[PDB]
From a paper:
The [name] family of transcriptional regulators activate suboptimal 19–20 bp spacer promoters in response to myriad cellular signals, ranging from heavy metals to drug-like compounds. Here we report one crystal structure of a multidrug-sensing [name] family regulator [name] and nine cryo-electron microscopy structures that capture the [name]-dependent transcription process from promoter opening to initial transcription to RNA elongation. These structures reveal that [name] is a dual ligand-binding factor that reshapes the suboptimal 19-bp spacer DNA to enable optimal promoter recognition, sustains promoter remodeling to stabilize initial transcribing complexes, and finally dissociates from the promoter to reverse DNA remodeling and facilitate the transition to elongation.
When including ribonucleoside triphosphates (rNTPs) in the complexes (see METHOD DETAILS), we obtained two structures of the [name]-promoter initial transcribing complexes ([name]) containing either a 3-nt de novo synthesized RNA transcript on the heteroduplex DNA scaffold (hereinafter designated [name]-[name]-3nt) or a 4-nt RNA transcript on a fully complementary DNA scaffold (hereinafter designated [name]-[name]-4nt). Compared with [name]-RPo, both [name]-[name]-3nt and [name]-[name]-4nt unwind the T:A base pair at position +3 and pull it into the polymerase through DNA scrunching, leading to a 1-nt transcription bubble expansion. Unlike site I, which is occupied by TPSb+ in all of the three [name]-[name]-promoter complexes, site II in [name]-[name]-3nt is vacant when CHAPSO was omitted during sample preparation, indicating that site II might have different selectivity for ligands compared with site I and that its occupancy is not essential for [name]-mediated transcription activation.
Numbering used by the authors:
A (entry chain C): 3 to 1341
B (entry chain D): 253 to 503
C (entry chain F): 410 to 562
D (entry chain D): 755 to 932, 948 to 1005
Amino acid sequence: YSYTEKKRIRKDFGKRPQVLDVPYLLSIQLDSFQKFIEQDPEGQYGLEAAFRSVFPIQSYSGNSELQYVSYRLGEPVFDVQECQIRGVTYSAPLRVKLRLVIYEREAPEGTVKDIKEQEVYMGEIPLMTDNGTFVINGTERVIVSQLHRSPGVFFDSDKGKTHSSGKVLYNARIIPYRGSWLDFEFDPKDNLFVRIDRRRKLPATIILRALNYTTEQILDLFFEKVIFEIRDNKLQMELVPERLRGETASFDIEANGKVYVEKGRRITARHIRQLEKDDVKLIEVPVEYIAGKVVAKDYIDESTGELICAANMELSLDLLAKLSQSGHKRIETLFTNDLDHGPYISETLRVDPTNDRLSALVEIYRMMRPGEPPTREAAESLFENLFFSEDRYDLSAVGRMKFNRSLLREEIEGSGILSKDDIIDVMKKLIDIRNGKGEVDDIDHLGNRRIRSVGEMAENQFRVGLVRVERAVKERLSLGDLDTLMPQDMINAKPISAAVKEFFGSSQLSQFMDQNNPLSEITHKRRISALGPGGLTRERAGFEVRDVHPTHYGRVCPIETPEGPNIGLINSLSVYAQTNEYGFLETPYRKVTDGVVTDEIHYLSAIEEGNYVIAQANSNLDEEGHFVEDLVTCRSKGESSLFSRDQVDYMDVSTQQVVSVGASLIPFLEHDDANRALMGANMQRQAVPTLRADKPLVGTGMERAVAVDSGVTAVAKRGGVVQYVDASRIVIKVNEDEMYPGEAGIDIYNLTKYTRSNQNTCINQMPCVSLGEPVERGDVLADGPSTDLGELALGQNMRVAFMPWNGYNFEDSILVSERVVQEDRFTTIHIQELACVSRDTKLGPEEITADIPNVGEAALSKLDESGIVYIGAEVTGGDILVGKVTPKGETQLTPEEKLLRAIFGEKASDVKDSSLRVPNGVSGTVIDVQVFTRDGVEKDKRALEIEEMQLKQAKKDLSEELQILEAGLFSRIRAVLVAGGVEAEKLDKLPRDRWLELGLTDEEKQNQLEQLAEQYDELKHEFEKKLEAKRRKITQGDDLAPGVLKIVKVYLAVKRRIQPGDKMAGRHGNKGVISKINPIEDMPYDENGTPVDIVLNPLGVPSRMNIGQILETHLGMAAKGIGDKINAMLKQQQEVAKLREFIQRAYDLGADVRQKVDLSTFSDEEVMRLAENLRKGMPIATPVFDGAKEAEIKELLKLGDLPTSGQIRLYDGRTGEQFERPVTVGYMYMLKLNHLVDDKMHARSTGSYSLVTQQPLGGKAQFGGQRFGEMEVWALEAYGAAYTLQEMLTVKSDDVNGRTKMYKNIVDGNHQMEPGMPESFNVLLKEIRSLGINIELED
Amino acid sequence: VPLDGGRFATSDLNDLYRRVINRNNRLKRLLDLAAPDIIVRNEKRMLQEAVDALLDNGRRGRAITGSNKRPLKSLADMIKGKQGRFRQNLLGKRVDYSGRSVITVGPYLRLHQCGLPKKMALELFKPFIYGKLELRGLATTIKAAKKMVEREEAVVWDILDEVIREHPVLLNRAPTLHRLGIQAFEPVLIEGKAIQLHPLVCAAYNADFDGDQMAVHVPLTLEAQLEARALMMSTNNILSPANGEPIIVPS
Amino acid sequence: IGLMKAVDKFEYRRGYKFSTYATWWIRQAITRSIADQARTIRIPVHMIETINKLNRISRQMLQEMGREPTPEELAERMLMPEDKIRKVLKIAKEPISMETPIGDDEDSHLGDFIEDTTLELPLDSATTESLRAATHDVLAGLTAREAKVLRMR
Amino acid sequence: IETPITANFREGLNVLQYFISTHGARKGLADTALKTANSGYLTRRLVDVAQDLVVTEDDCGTHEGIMMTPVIEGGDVKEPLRDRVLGRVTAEDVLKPGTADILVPRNTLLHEQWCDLLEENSVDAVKVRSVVSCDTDFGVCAHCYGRDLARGHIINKGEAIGVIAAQSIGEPGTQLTMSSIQVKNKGSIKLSNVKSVVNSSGKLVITSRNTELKLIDEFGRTKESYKVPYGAVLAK
Ligand code: 118
Ligand SMILES: [Mg+2]
Ligand SMILES: [Mg+2]
Ligand SMILES: [Zn+2]
């Protein structure tokens, strides 16, 4: 067992072995940016393939060009934490290398005229930190992936719903990454149509004329031909029999043999069987049979040149005779079979007004741009721009693969522009679907939806920046003299920087991070959204896209999703899910070879898995892979059934590959209703971290990975031995094997103390290790918020009883003991920030001072002489934190106030009080102050003091490492001059810096005795560089906005104890509000005197079917009951053998579980450390669909001498009597949610009104009123309460004279009103008169 | 209007009026230079389009957009719709003398009683307390009464107890589906911050204690107090108005 | 309107084409109308040219240094007093629309949170009236003729 | 799906049973949120059509009305006569099933005692008063409306009945989902809207399309009613 895991081992109840480990849970964000910023010698990725798609930019006339050669990214100015303190973006500069080549066309192409090479600066790129976030303007942000529809071709139909006849109508769409849309469709009368960008509709074959096709070739590539001979004036026809399937003869079919089928008899399969087995060649038929068929070719008279029949004309014996009277011995006709070979394109050709290429182009032009007649070049260019130019159209590298695979071609790669074969193949397959071959595809399959991530949505915006730069580089290459021009003078960098920073800062997918928990961030970085640019809209998404689809299995979690109007649109990735190179989700499976499950893993996509038979994870194995039985439950083709043990191709890797990470932390999920597991998974992400952290007694084994992979702890990089521990830093001394041969080998970890998070909670680390103990690579060295020894701890485990108590737990209410509020188990620290900004005015600058006019000198005690509060003060609402005065314009005085000034002689002064104060209700301790002043402004006493002390302990943190480098170096030279003798103790009595002038050895030793003084100054080569750089970064000014002179920021800290009104919940969807804190001696107690912590209602369980909260309560008792035994043996002072035996009996208990703990390989101190860690209960592990069973729970309850039924007898605390029946008592795990009642309470008597309508403002942050909405007026006029309503409308909201007259009536003790006309009615009358309408009030 | 920082903010009707003014001035210039008619016609077309976009923006063509690529709002979009004057400012408003908070259960109350926190009641009842303070001579002027209330002296809590005596209070929970969604109670001052509701009225409200919140309103005049006592008090509302059945059944 | 002036000032005897003379007046008219219209708050022409020159300098200093220059590094090259360089940098901002969506939704706008600042609080109205009454009562103690002079004074 | 879930929550489901049980859960959760909007929009249209109707007068003085009977279709009696006349006002002087059994000044608020009196006799049709036949213009009268269903007495003049009607209809809208005749009990058989003929096999046939067949109780109150298809041969 590992070092940090051998401290407290959690007992495992799971049965199935594990083949694949849980991957790194942040790979989706970290593998996607690394493709965008990396060097790729082959393109297709990121910056390289964005520079290879604009350049080279060639002159407008053809004279000169610009050529890209390479790029590189620089180093950032500040690191992440400096960026967060100062409030600036964390980015790196991009420096590209170009060359400018001028060349002439007088000489043929001569291009060695000149060459000018230079390196240009193109902007800043924000960088991703090592946890997957971006710092932008000082705040951490997350970019969320997007699930959207792939490019390519999609065949669909409306199912008998558009037309009244109940006929289905088919259509086909082509959709590019960038370009215009092209779609074909059918109509009731079976004519193909086409449209472009959902514009007005045109017949299909128009676009076949604009590709230079004639009616001959149009009918050639769509139809089949049958030939007729004239030989003896007798029409003969060469036939293959199968063409006559499903018909009925109107004539006699004669042949060499049998006279097969005649009047009334229709042709069955055995008839064409005769005709094929006898190989019937040309058959004579009546000449009335061919009359009505259409002709393929265009036939003209040879002598006179007059045409007899054109292509696609129906025949009659008139024209057949006319044809045979001219000498034509053959006729081609189009083979039609009215069930499979219908006439569609040939009857389509007969509604076109077009006859050749020019008329078709003119008609397309008339469609796209109505209102002007085109010319022979405008039409051709417009049609050549739509789908056939690489700079206005691009099917992405994935759109081409999807296009090729949806038409059964065999090539994967190709071009991004359309072709003639492509449009012809799309028409062909739409027609085949119309004739009952193949089927439509569905749009919610996870083979028709893909994921794009940060490193692709950033590249797609860098490219539009580059395009806007090229469109202005092209001009300067035309208009002027290219002799004295360098490439720096041609590239403006602001379009690119604007395009990048707008995406990273104001997009819809770039979001303010959720930072309550480790789990809150882990979940926010794995979310998948369907909204955003290029996705759906909330109001216009239907029912079918919000549902669960059979292809979600293993790729998307079916449980965790919001509950408002966003319910189906936002999803979460599963535990083992991955992504393809094209952006399609895939899942791992094990391969089954000859009835033997093998340990080899294959990732499969949603299209590939439908072809195989895949077994389940709940399947037993005969110790070599063989299935133990002969009917296995399996999935195939989207369904589930029983199968033999030889029809099986794959198997699942684990029982938890179907759930997300937030729902794999619920114990006994298999016993919960799904409507409640949804709520439990949602509410786990709102828990607040408490003062002390406490592991769960019943977990699922999934807490260690969520804690470590969130980057909220300090993990050791290299093994070693702890050399220094403090409350604020740790120093590790590395081993010799992991040691790098060139440096000192000392790791330093600096912990984070009392920092505020995005949600005003407290981030704080504290060390786990003690001084002098060994440490291996990957071990946890310090804990973050909500972590205990390296495991996620979101709440505290309470002692609960399920029973009613006097109506205090009536509807989801909770009743709490006073011992819970007096042990500080649910107390939380909140940190809040306030700011005071000093600006310029038209009358002169404001000043931050301590000479505040018209305030008593008691209220100025907590300020220092610079005008700012001290660190360590205790402030409450109303106190002054930063004193400030503003210059004031001269004021008028009322006559009465003038006489008052004349009598009492006092005069006012030129300045006004604008100080910063504590908001009401808040009471806190000041813990931090920061001052930012402008370059060119006098720094003040307090700013200089902050300067001094941060300089001081900024210097002190650097002199610590030179002692490892300098002093040891002396011990190196101590043994190289003494060579030739031993002068050790004589050498130990003189000072050390004098160790250069000792008894000198031979000249070899002497020249290296000067080499030592070379290295002894190499040390001062390296030191002062670093120190001066740090001092310069400390004492330098900053970049405050235009107009502001300085800024002061104060940080308060507040403690919040639990109280009636606070919301509380568990992991099973059970939630409720605290209703009462009641004394310790009113609580129900058991026969041993021990009272209970929390009392819950039993009426909540049956009608919600979250049974997992009962079983947990029974298991948490069995765990606690074991600790109480170990605890006793440590008070009773038993020897180590008794503890060894009892703990080994406790770890060996259960059915054939996969875990094996043998303590006989432990030392005695290790057993005692484990026992001291277990003396408050033994922790248990219960995976989601692999957990513990009631037999094992009861066996463990017996091991701790507890009742097997799980129910005990309780007494009433107020009367001492017994309750009639036994009660369920156990240990549950509860969580305090960030819905505190201090935030939510609000009230307003009067306040500020808005500008136009002059009604109260809204919100608690604005001290606003409450909306008396539209459907509350209905209730009030259903009661008949007319005066209540008239006062809600006039004098409380909106009447300007009445609302100030009412106040002075209320102060004088007269409850009466005088209502007038509201203000918004007058606003309405003005805005109607401004439309030209005369509206007025008649009297 | 200026914001904090020197930046300004403006309406869209300014953007739409400037275009009209300086396309009308140009036409008054061209009619004096005696230009060709092909140019005066183009001016008259542009003037027509500008006035149309000032009155109703997206009606006769493409919608004119602003420098952030959003269509400008017009004189007709300020009257009509879910966010026009009619439905947003005239048929429902924001009001003074009101608050809200989380609710919890008190099982010891009578049917005509609710529990109200002390701090909410001190804020909602301020002018009543000022007048009562300066009637007893405990304060000389209204501005000293303000500081007495702000310091929370001991006599303030004794004036508050006789101000709320026989003063009803309207409670309301959204969505208000029928008229039993607003009812009048008599308040009982408590410590703490959550409101306490009688267990028998949670069925007309459709309320429960998994986190719901409620709003509080104060009637000011004599007639509103009479109507809150006679018409809306919870002890007159035992029957349903849809069918004649009782509504207070135990759950 | 500029082409209609180039046509009025042309002289064919000088031998040049019409394009060469007309382009000057066309560009002049368009440039003069961009600087007079197209801003909500109008800036004079000399300030427009000062703004444009400072933009042109900061472009090349940004290309050359790799950073954005502080107003000191712009004052040293533009050769103007630094306070004027600080004064110019505030005049180049266009007012925000009051329909700007603020939140996740698009039903909350910037113009909803803008407060009226020219209203008097009702405590101040009550104080004014009480002081008027108190003064009227104290002015009744002394003589009528000796209070008429204070009322007039 | 073909194979059902053969397990319960006390025993625990499979991965597969849980997966196929999530479909219906999300379907219900999604229908709720997208039904609330339709319900609110319907309530708003009802309030807007009904908002200006108020009880204006005391008595208009008509003799018109509507005929209230129980509903017996679809099986047993689904709605008794008592639940449909309690509170209404009688339009004419109804008489217990003999002749001249007057209970009425012919304006009689049918409170509970009158309903008991009607049920100790057996009468199954009463002519009552209604608002769709009121003679008052710009309002209704108090007698055509009847009882205030939340106070228990005659409605007061000045009451806003339109907003109450709209709110009462709209409030429950969130719970809405969005070969031979046999005879049960013994009684007379009655036919209406009929025209008959004797058959060749000694049975009854009728040449009516729209006839009705009723079952008569001990006292003569109709307990069941069907209609026969045209051309059918009546067995008895
Ligand atoms: C042909 C080519 C350039 C200019 Sb010009 C200009 C002229 C009138 C009004 C505005 C601009 C110019 C500027 C200085 C000295 C001489 C000519 C000009 C300036 C910048 C960019 C492009 C053209 C004019 C005609
Ligand atoms: Mg929301
Ligand atoms: Mg609730
Ligand atoms: Zn009537």
